[PDB]
Design a protein around this nucleic acid. Structure first.
Ligand SMILES: [Zn+2]
Ligand SMILES: [Zn+2]
Lengths: 107, 764, 375, 127, 248, 149, 50, 99
RNA sequence: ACAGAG
DNA sequence: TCCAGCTCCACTTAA
DNA sequence: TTAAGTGGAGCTGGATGCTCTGT
């Protein structure tokens, strides 16, 4: 990330001193000792998942005493939760039911 | 429930044709030239001064144009009709008279009317003999009441300066390169100098390119040259989003690799890259203050208002690289039209400056050497520098001005007199910008921006399909406004000045810029109150009625365009689902109480524009009106032009058929005018017994086609007969051709001159 | 709506009208102020306002790498000269600030110290922006370069060198800095106020809203109207409201200076009330016992002969006799311009005016029963 | 962060805290006055021509409207771009020929931008 | 037939995507015999063509998969003793995409045309995290080159072919079967013939230069014949095969 | 792009089921029906287009692109992907066309005109190259095909 | 050709060998099929099919 | 070519010559079909223009009805007397000895 | 050099 | 307006 | 340490439909 000198407002560079790494200006004496953990997370865009789970994938989210799907009222359906974008998104829930003479897709 | 309907709403169109549109565009540009621009060009060239021997000066005071004259053999002068100048193969001009003030030792000697040149007077302009006359007084001049005018007469032929189509100057075009990169450019054209600047992103770091620099210099060194030296203020003016700083970072990292941290260092870096025509610092400072972005003004070497503009350019490149929103050239908010006056202004300015330079050369030859008797420059006012310049640039068709680097060809064409529609159809043509270089298939299409401004079907078929177009029936082309009260109104409506803030306010979500023809007038919050209050000040008669306003909500700008040469179209204002024009208003128009300007003043009819009808919502008919409609179309048959207004039921046809009729309708045999017998042309086709059409459009009544028609009513059975009518052939009747059907006349010409040579002998 | 809350009085002060500036720091945030930094100098040129400050950064803090300060001071200063030198010691101790001017005119910007209940305004004298200077790097480059290595018409005013020679003629004016924490800052903050009553009526600000709209948005260097209505109030039922008669009685009084009043009451408009249109029509011209004829001081050679001949329209129904036409003292060349087109010829009787004594006593109006003789 | 409005600024400076705050307000170019015997032309009347005294009454209305009634005219008041950098309202005193005093009076955070109500100035006499 | 072809529309090879240059510029691109053309397609046949679970493995085996497309957060971490870049592989989306990639594969995908980073500079501390300690490039570069790798490291490829833009599983419609062919918009024929799971004996291409470089001159002749005849068929024209045979 | 396929599916159902409803009520000895059955001039699309319903007007394969900002013309609301607002012409050539439908039909026709006018410089140069490269070939008497040399 | 203002050229050979190469090779009765695929081109047209 | 506008111009002109009108063919409007069909039946003609035709060669009537009406045909400038051209041998150029 | 025509 | 050759310069292997 | 063979990038030079019919 860009960080700028409070004095002259040029761009700081990271360098190493005798006790710490420092943010340092190239044009004025100002330095800032990195005393503690500092971070910057990008969170880039992940792949699409729409055509990846279709067609009898290796799902696993099913559990004992799981709810039946609302239309058929049978537990013959899978359900999953995934991030669709990066993991700062709150996970969305989706489910699909597959029964005899019955095909549907629901949210 | 049906919305009530005004049925006489059509009658605004014959009121509109009294004043504006339909060759009145050419007339209102030529009168604009010979009434203000010939004074404004003379103002900026008011004094010539000899280099040697000072305290001697020629000062121009006032210029005129006057009435058309002919200069005969024995120095007798008389006014002249345009038809006498058609027959005798002479030009139709008027002498330019200027009064001066010069010095022959005696310091104040003046004149009153010194003829320096002859201006070709366009027909039915303010100085023609035909204006303001009755139809029984056109008979004594051998001229038609229906001949539209707008054309010149030079050496006997009729020549038309065609409408050109050019891109708008002083505008940031964000476009893609050939290799896929996205950059920007703005053709910074003013009256004095035209030049293009660029913005290249060839390595992920921003470079600026120009025709003066021998290498493209990075943009942060240019910012450090323009007085902002901190990197923080530069990144403020670019933007404060995360991905914008990520995209801009490798340009700061390039600038810190060189030792450029100071303004004088940046100017010393720029001065080592200038192609040579105090060198290093000052030939860079005068460069950035006079040539690069030369329309954004620097007052006293204050470079703040140019830094904001170039940061707007870099931010638009950064935002357009993410989602590929390049600007199309073919949107007609970006096209401008250049009429005959704006070409003759450039031509006469170059000719007048060459006249003053030739006169200064003669003055510097005969002041230091010859004689103590003080010469006057009245004995060196040669008239043939201006006259032959005007006549040769109109008659030949090239406008090669060395001062402005303009090298156009094929501007003027001979006015075609095949029929009446061919003469009127030529006075609405718009030649295009590219002029048939390669098979583009990009501007040859029909973009939806031409609604009501240009004609859909009327185009030539062949190599110029889409590159020669035609105006619609109800259009108008603006001229240059005085630019005075628009700034004085915009400064009182919440526009902060741009100097009173850093660059961080430009990246706010609720802060919009305002532009005036490319220059930044500042920023503003609550743009809707600005737009609505400015439209109320336009409707109330304070701001001139052709000053458009728009809002690009994506790029966050509020444009104001006071410039000249852009297309307008009238509309009916709609306020809360009811039209502002009532039946009472149209009854008052039909009885004669009011005119179209009274519809303009009372906030009933307002002019729109191609950039301004991007904001508005228009209904075609009265029963299309819902709650978000601000304007109502007056007549939807004004979408079709003049040559497509002969076709009956043209919405039942297929669309190429109307194009083929727009081609054939300029070639039908007919009658030229009422002076078709006293007229000697190179070629003239007439029909013997013409008849007016039986099924006719209202455009036919508006342009008076059925007073002199082209065609005959044929009784037609539609059947297969005799097998000689297989592919498009048609079988006539021998006893109808004998009775006069289809009988035509062909007139030609044969001229012969008998000249007297320099040796005193003569042809006989 | 109604002003339900906080009808705050606005007061205007003038005591600091020639002294108050507004400095703003484009690259320094609004939290990290300069309240603590020990300032050293404060310089100004009073015309062409260019304020150059200097501020002292401390050395013993851990945000001052002395290994770089020694090197930059060796690069800027001469190594042992110190006769004229930007820094006193062996280090970089200062950070100099250089101003740039925002606008020329500040007649519209006003600083506002809001207290409780009221708001005091004070006009500024300028806005200056203070950016950190980088001149010492170019001075270091100067010390690095000096160690090793009947004339024609001209334009100098639009150049840089003549501009720098023209600005630097103003001598520097030094000032003593007094910070925000000083007790002088509280004492000179009360000159932003103005002492006055709670009720003060202003004998300025008298201009009506129409006059203010006309004032800020001027007429376009002077108006020219001739035909709003396409005949100039003369055809299309002979009079018409597009040029409004109620707004302009004057244009028809120029045009139709002789007409019956019943035509005017029918053609002026139905929406305009009766006594208001009588007061509008009455003041623009003369009346002769119910015959309204043009105010000759506006129409036309003196008005005194015009007033006496308008009195002659009152005297005799046979308007001017040929000797009394000379008595009324008109322009002798313009007797046909004044009387011929405005009257009727009958034999040996002079002139018969178009408007006889009409039915104004038949009309219900009671005030021009007696206004015509006092006017 | 949400964007604040002028009624929300003139409510906190009286109810929440009594502490004074330095506002920086932009007026229109000509104020509805006359230059009093100032050797004229109907030119611009600004604050460099008026005298001290109550120059107007500021009317805050229901539903957020804020008007500056400056005599017979009611003006309009809107917030400007919110500045978030360091603004210092300083004084400069040239009490002598070449030496004097500089005093800092405080800080400036908020901005106001005033504009004439053209709809209300226009609806009295249209054109 | 070059004058007869109106440069028509409605051509997608039956998938409502994968736009192809047809008409006069297609015949122009064939007879110019250029080395690179717009819209190339390598049509591959799959051997175990019964199920879609087999098709998506070999789809992800050839398609260009970026490191920035499988990492949930890519961060710099500044420390008082060191500075580096930390990349945590979102292994859930690795398990869903059926890919052969983990941290040791990403370590091997790094040090292939990136700044000359050393393999010692990259560690595999977990089964997700991959830290990249930068160095001094020392060729017009400062050690603050972490900003270069902060946007450059998500453009390295960990699985697939570098030249392939995209790919789409294509199905048939006939009632007798349901089998899965593979449309590869790419410009590397030898790579698609060599990946496990793709029947290399039955895959073709549009670009004749790749067919000449991989399979020989006689297969390039047959590709010219088939492609000119296919372009002539798709616009309603018909030419006897002896003419295109003589041209090839 | 999913929505575009469903709308181009539904707007092609209207043209086909409206054009198969006009051909069931035309009598024999109709003139365009006779000229379409014998294949001499015309087709069934022309009869079903100038009687029943002119189809979706398409410029280069897709619906009418936006020339203004996020809409096709100012006469329609922004972001609307309706049938009528993007090129569908509900009228035939018998009942006339509306202004927006006529302008969209002219947009669809000028593309055909400009392809006809661009084709001439597009093909003749290619045939010049093919002739200058192929003209030496001749079937000989021994059933070979040899070049000039 | 379509008979709508359409012009066509003519060339008269001047030698007997140029006559015989025009009559046998370039005849209309010897060019009833196109050389492209072998489909007839000189055949019936409109009003001879209707 | 789908010119229905000629088929309506013919009918409108026929219904407008029988009672002295000029039926408008204004774009996006004009005289409708239902108002010109009723002016033909009032004057004794068919309501769609198609007329009973006795032929002129044989003298016996045609089977189909033929569609009469006035259409406004215009004559174009391209005449054959100014386009016929024939060179046997004549003047040649000077540089290249070819016509 | 420009406009046409196929 | 689009596309093959020609020449300059870093980038590894190898001694 | 450096000689050398081969990659990649910028510059350069070529090309862009057939005729008549008039000024
Ligand atoms: Zn710094
Ligand atoms: Zn189920």
């Amino acid at each position: 990330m860009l960080l700028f000198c409070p004095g002259c407002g040029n761009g700081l560079i990271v360098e190493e001193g005798q006790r710490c790494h420092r943010f340092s200006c190239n044009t004025c004496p100002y330095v800032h000792n990195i005393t503690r953990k500092v971070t910057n997370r990008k969170y880039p865009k992940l792949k699409e998942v729409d055509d990846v789970l279709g067609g009898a994938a290796a799902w696993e989210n099913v559990d004992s005493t799981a709810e039946s799907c609302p239309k058929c009222e049978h537990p013959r359906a899978y359900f999953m939760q995934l991030q669709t974008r990066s993991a700062d998104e709150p996970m969305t829930t989706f489910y699909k039911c597959c029964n005899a003479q019955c095909g549907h897709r629901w949210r | 429930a049906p919305i009530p309907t005004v049925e006489e709403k059509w009658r605004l169109l014959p009121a509109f044709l009294k004043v504006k549109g339909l060759v009145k565009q050419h007339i209102d540009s030529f009168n604009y030239f010979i009434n203000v621009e010939i004074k404004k060009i003379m103002k900026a060239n008011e004094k010539v001064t000899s280099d040697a021997d000072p305290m001697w000066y020629l000062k121009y005071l006032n210029i005129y144009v006057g009435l058309p004259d002919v200069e005969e053999s024995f120095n007798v002068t008389r006014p002249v009709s345009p038809h006498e100048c058609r027959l005798r193969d002479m030009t139709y001009s008027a002498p330019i008279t200027v009064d001066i003030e010069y010095t022959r030792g005696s310091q104040r000697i003046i004149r009153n009317a010194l003829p320096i040149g002859r201006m070709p007077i366009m027909l039915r302009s303010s100085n023609c003999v035909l204006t303001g006359k009755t139809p029984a007084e056109f008979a004594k001049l051998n001229e038609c009441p229906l001949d539209p005018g707008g054309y010149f007469i030079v050496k006997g032929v009729e020549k038309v300066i065609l409408i050109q189509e050019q891109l708008s100057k002083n505008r940031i075009i964000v476009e893609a390169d050939r290799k896929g990169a996205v950059g920007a450019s703005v053709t910074s054209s003013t009256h004095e100098k035209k030049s293009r600047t660029n913005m290249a992103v060839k390595q992920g770091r921003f470079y600026l390119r120009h025709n003066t620099l021998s290498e493209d210099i990075p943009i942060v060194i240019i910012f450090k040259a323009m007085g902002v030296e901190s990197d923080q203020e530069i990144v403020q003016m670019i933007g404060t989003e995360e991905h914008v700083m990520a995209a801009f970072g490798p340009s700061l990292e390039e600038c810190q690799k060189a030792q450029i941290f100071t303004q004088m260092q940046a100017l010393k870096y720029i001065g080592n890259k200038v192609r040579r025509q105090k060198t290093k610092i000052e030939e860079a400072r005068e460069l950035l203050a006079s040539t690069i972005l030369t329309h954004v003004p620097v007052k006293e070497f204050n470079f703040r208002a140019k830094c904001i503009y170039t940061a707007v350019m870099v931010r638009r490149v950064i935002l357009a690289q993410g989602d590929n929103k390049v600007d199309d050239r073919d949107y007609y908010g970006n096209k401008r039209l250049e009429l005959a006056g704006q070409l003759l202004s450039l031509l006469f300015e170059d000719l007048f400056k060459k006249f003053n330079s030739e006169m200064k050369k003669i003055a510097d030859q005969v002041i230091p050497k010859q004689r103590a008797a003080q010469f006057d420059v009245v004995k060196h006012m040669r008239q043939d520098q201006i006259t032959n310049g005007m006549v040769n640039a109109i008659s030949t068709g090239n406008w090669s001005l060395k001062r402005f680097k303009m090298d156009r060809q094929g501007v003027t064409q001979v006015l075609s007199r095949l029929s009446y529609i061919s003469a009127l159809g030529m006075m609405t043509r718009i030649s295009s910008q590219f002029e048939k270089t390669r098979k583009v298939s990009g501007p040859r299409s029909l973009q939806p921006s031409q609604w009501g401004m240009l004609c859909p079907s009327d185009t030539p078929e062949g190599e110029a399909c889409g590159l020669v177009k035609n105006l619609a029936l109800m259009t108008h082309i603006t001229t240059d406004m005085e630019d005075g009260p628009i700034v004085k109104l915009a400064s009182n409506l919440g526009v902060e000045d741009v100097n009173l803030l850093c660059g961080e306010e430009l990246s706010y979500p609720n802060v919009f810029l305002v532009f005036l023809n490319g220059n930044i007038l500042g920023v503003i919050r609550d743009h809707k109150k600005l737009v609505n209050t400015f439209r109320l000040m336009r409707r109330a008669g304070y701001i001139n009625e052709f000053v458009s306003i728009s809002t690009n909500l994506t790029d966050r700008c509020v444009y104001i365009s006071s410039d000249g040469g852009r297309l307008c179209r009238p509309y009916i204002i709609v306020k809360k689902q009811k039209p502002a024009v009532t039946n009472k208003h149209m009854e008052e128009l039909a009885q004669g109480y009011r005119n179209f300007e009274d519809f303009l003043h009372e906030s009933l009819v307002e002019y729109l524009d191609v950039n301004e009808e991007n904001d508005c919502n228009i209904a075609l008919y009265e029963h299309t009106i819902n709650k978000d409609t601000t304007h109502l179309e007056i007549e939807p048959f004004t979408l079709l032009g003049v040559c497509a207004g002969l076709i009956p039921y043209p919405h039942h046809n297929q669309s190429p058929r109307n194009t083929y009729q727009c081609a054939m309708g300029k070639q039908a045999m007919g009658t030229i005018g009422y002076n078709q017998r006293n007229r000697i042309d190179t070629l003239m086709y007439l029909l013997a017994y013409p008849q007016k059409p039986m099924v006719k459009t209202k455009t036919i009544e508006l342009i008076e086609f059925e007073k002199l028609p082209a065609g005959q009513n044929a009784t037609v059975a539609v059947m297969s007969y005799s097998g000689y009518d297989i592919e498009d052939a048609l079988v006539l009747n021998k006893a109808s051709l004998d009775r006069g059907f289809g009988r035509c006349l062909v007139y030609k010409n044969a001229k012969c001159t008998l000249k007297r040579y320099t040796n005193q002998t003569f042809d006989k | 709506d109604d002003p339900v809350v906080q009808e705050i009085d606005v007061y205007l002060a003038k005591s600091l009208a020639e002294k108050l500036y507004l400095f703003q720091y484009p690259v320094r945030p609004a939290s990290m102020t300069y309240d603590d930094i020990p300032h050293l100098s404060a310089k100004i040129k009073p015309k062409q306002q260019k304020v150059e400050l200097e501020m002292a950064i401390d050395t013993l803090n851990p945000n001052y790498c002395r290994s770089k300060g020694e090197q930059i001071a060796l690069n800027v200063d001469g190594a042992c000269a110190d006769e004229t030198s930007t820094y006193s010691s062996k280090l970089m101790d200062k950070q100099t600030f250089c101003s740039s001017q925002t606008t020329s005119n500040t007649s519209r910007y006003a600083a506002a110290l809001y207290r409780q209940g009221e708001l005091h305004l004070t006009p500024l004298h300028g806005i200056l922006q203070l950016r950190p200077s980088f001149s010492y790097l170019d001075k270091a480059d100067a010390k690095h370069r000096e160690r090793e290595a009947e004339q024609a018409r001209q334009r100098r005013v639009q150049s840089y060198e003549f501009l720098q020679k023209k600005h630097a003629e103003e001598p520097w004016v030094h000032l003593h800095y007094y910070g925000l924490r000083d007790s002088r800052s509280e004492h000179e903050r009360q000159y932003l106020l103005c002492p006055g009553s709670s009720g003060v009526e202003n004998t300025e600000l008298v201009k009506s809203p129409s006059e203010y709209l006309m004032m800020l948005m001027p007429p376009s260097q002077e108006e020219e109207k001739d035909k709003p209505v396409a005949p100039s109030n003369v055809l299309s039922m002979a009079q018409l409201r597009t040029l409004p008669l109620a707004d302009q009685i004057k244009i028809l009084m120029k045009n139709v200076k002789v007409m019956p009043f019943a035509n005017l009451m029918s053609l002026l408009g139905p929406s305009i009330d009766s006594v208001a249109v009588l007061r509008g029509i009455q003041k623009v011209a003369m009346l002769v016992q119910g015959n309204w004829v043009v105010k000759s001081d506006i129409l036309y050679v003196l008005c005194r002969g015009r007033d006496f001949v308008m009195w002659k329209f009152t005297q005799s129904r046979w308007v001017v006799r040929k000797e009394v036409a000379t008595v009324t003292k008109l322009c002798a060349e313009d007797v046909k311009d004044f009387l011929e087109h405005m009257a009727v010829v009958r034999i040996n009787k002079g002139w018969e005016f178009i408007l006889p004594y009409d039915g104004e006593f038949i009309k219900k109006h009671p005030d021009v029963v007696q206004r015509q003789h006092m006017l | 962060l949400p964007k604040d409005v002028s009624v929300a600024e003139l409510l906190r400076e009286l109810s929440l805290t009594k502490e004074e705050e330095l506002l920086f307000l932009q007026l229109p170019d000509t104020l509805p006055g006359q230059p009093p015997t100032q050797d004229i032309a109907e030119n611009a009347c600004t604050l460099a021509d008026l005298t001290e005294g109550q120059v107007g009454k500021l009317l805050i209305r229901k539903s957020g409207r804020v008007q500056l009634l400056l005599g017979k005219v009611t003006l309009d008041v809107t917030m400007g771009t919110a500045c978030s950098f360091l603004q210092e309202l300083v004084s400069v005193g040239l009490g002598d020929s070449r030496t004097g005093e500089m005093t800092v009076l405080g800080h400036v955070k908020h901005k106001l931008v005033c504009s004439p109500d053209f709809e209300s100035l226009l609806d009295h006499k249209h054109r | 037939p070059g004058t007869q072809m109106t440069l028509k529309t409605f051509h997608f090879a039956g998938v409502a995507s994968m736009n192809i240059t047809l008409g006069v510029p297609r015949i122009k691109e064939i007879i110019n015999a250029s080395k690179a053309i717009s819209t190339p397609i390598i049509t591959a046949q799959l051997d175990k063509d019964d199920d879609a679970d087999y098709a998506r493995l070999v789809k992800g085996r050839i398609e260009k998969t970026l490191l920035g497309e499988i990492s949930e957060y890519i961060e710099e971490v500044f420390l008082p003793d060191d500075c580096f870049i930390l990349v945590k592989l979102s292994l859930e989306r690795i398990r869903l995409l059926r890919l052969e990639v983990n941290a040791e594969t990403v370590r091997y995908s790094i040090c292939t045309s990136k700044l000359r980073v050393k393999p010692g500079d990259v560690a595999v501390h977990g089964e997700a995290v991959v830290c990249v300690t930068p160095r001094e490039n020392s060729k017009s570069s400062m050690y603050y080159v972490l900003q270069f790798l902060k946007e450059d490291l998500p453009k390295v490829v960990v699985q697939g072919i570098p030249e392939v833009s995209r790919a789409v599983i294509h199905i048939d419609e006939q009632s007798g079967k349901e089998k899965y062919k593979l449309l590869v918009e790419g410009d590397n024929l030898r790579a698609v013939m060599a990946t496990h799971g793709v029947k290399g004996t039955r895959t073709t291409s549009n670009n004749t230069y790749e067919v000449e470089k991989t399979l020989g001159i006689e297969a390039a002749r047959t590709t010219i014949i088939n492609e000119i005849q296919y372009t002539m068929v798709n616009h309603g024209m018909s030419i006897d095969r002896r003419h295109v045979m003589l041209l090839s | 792009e999913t929505l575009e396929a469903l709308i181009l599916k539904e707007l092609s159902v209207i043209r086909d089921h409206a054009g198969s409803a006009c051909l069931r009520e035309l009598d024999k000895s109709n003139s365009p029906l006779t000229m379409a059955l014998c294949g001499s001039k015309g087709s069934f699309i022309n009869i079903s287009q100038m009687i029943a319903c002119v189809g979706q007007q398409a410029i280069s394969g897709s619906r009418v692109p936006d020339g203004f900002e996020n809409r096709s013309l100012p006469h329609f609301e922004k972001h609307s992907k309706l049938p009528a607002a993007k090129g569908f012409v509900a009228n035939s050539f018998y009942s006339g066309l509306t202004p927006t439908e006529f302008f969209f039909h002219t947009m669809a026709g000028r593309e055909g005109l400009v392809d006809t006018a661009v084709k001439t410089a597009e093909t003749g140069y290619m045939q010049r190259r093919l002739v200058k490269s192929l003209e030496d070939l001749c079937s000989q008497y021994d059933l070979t095909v040899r070049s000039s040399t | 050709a379509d008979f709508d203002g359409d012009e066509m050229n003519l060339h008269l050979p001047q030698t007997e060998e140029a006559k015989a190469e025009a009559l046998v090779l370039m005849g209309t009765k010897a060019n009833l099929v196109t050389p492209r695929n072998g489909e007839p081109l000189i055949a019936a047209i409109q009003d001879f099919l209707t | 070519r789908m010119t229905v506008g000629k088929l309506i111009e013919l009918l409108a002109g026929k219904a407008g010559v029988l009672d002295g009108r000029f039926h408008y063919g204004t774009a996006f409007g004009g005289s409708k079909v239902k108002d010109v069909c009723e002016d033909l039946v009032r004057h004794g003609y068919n309501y769609l223009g198609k007329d009973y035709v006795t032929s002129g060669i044989t003298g016996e009537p045609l089977e189909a009805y033929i569609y009469f009406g006035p259409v406004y045909y215009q004559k174009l400038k391209h005449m054959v007397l100014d386009k016929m051209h024939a060179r046997a041998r004549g003047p040649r150029a000077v540089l290249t000895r070819q016509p």
